[PDB]
Design a protein around this ligand. Structure first.
Ligand code: 397
Lengths: 223, 9
């Protein structure tokens, strides 16, 4: 399985576009958290299937598959959010029927913090002109690097090898192939940071029972 | 939930 074919299978693992079935209208704190949690829950279902489509993932121990997903899920969601928002500066495209503005993030205490973080990282990927295939490798690495053991490192290395390949196809300088690789990877730190904050904020919302009970989301949030 | 989806298609 060459880098190109591995990237192809990631493309084929891409989850489908999700909508929350919500008639267009202004947002409030009760409806925003409602939509954000409802969307996350649905995306979580598609994320599980996506992972299983990653060559070798289902070959890992059951203990590993669970710990990998339980720890990276929010990062993967936010990485998807950023790729969808890339061509819409100043906007967070959570879903076709859930587009948010920075000022709208003021309807919820503490979320404006997280939006700015997301908008910044997104803007960054925009400056770098993140390509789809890079997005596929990066997202895959987030799952595999958010820690049967050898199989994992083997898989992680394969995806890493796929990212380099994608960068090599752009036909840019070698020095620039290295600069780009590092800049794309250094951003994972910001996605992991906006993630930890998003979890903290979400966990806090749960403890207050301000958001409906989403079995899958609840389970992933607790551990 | 997470485990059953990991063991079914
Ligand atoms: O694709 C995505 C990406 C992120 C979210 C999401 C929900 C949510 C709820 C919070 O209290 C805080 C941050 C959040 O981020 C939902 C779907």
């Amino acid at each position: 399985l060459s880098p190109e074919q591995l990237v192809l299978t990631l493309l084929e693992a891409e989850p489908p576009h999700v909508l929350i079935s919500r008639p267009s209208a202004p947002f409030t704190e009760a409806s925003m958290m409602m939509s954000l949690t409802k969307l996350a829950d649905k995306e979580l279902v598609h994320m599980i299937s996506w992972a299983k489509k990653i060559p070798g993932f289902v070959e890992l121990s059951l203990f590993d598959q669970v710990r990998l997903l339980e720890s990276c899920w929010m990062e993967v969601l936010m990485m998807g959010l950023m790729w969808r928002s890339i061509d819409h500066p100043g906007k967070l495209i959570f879903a076709p029927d859930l587009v948010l503005d920075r000022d709208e993030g003021k309807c919820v205490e503490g979320i404006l913090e997280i939006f700015d973080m997301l908008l910044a990282t997104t803007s960054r990927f925009r400056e770098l002109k993140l390509q789809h295939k890079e997005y596929l490798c990066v997202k895959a690495m987030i799952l595999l690097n958010s820690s049967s053991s050898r199989k994992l490192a083997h898989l992680l290395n394969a995806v890493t090898d796929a990212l380099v390949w994608v960068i090599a196809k752009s036909g840019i300088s070698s020095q620039q192939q290295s600069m780009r690789l590092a800049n794309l990877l250094m951003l994972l730190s910001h996605v992991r940071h906006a993630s930890n904050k998003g979890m903290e904020h979400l966990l806090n919302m749960k403890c207050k029972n301000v958001v409906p009970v989403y079995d899958l989301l609840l389970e992933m949030l607790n551990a | 939930k997470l485990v059953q989806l990991l063991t079914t298609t």
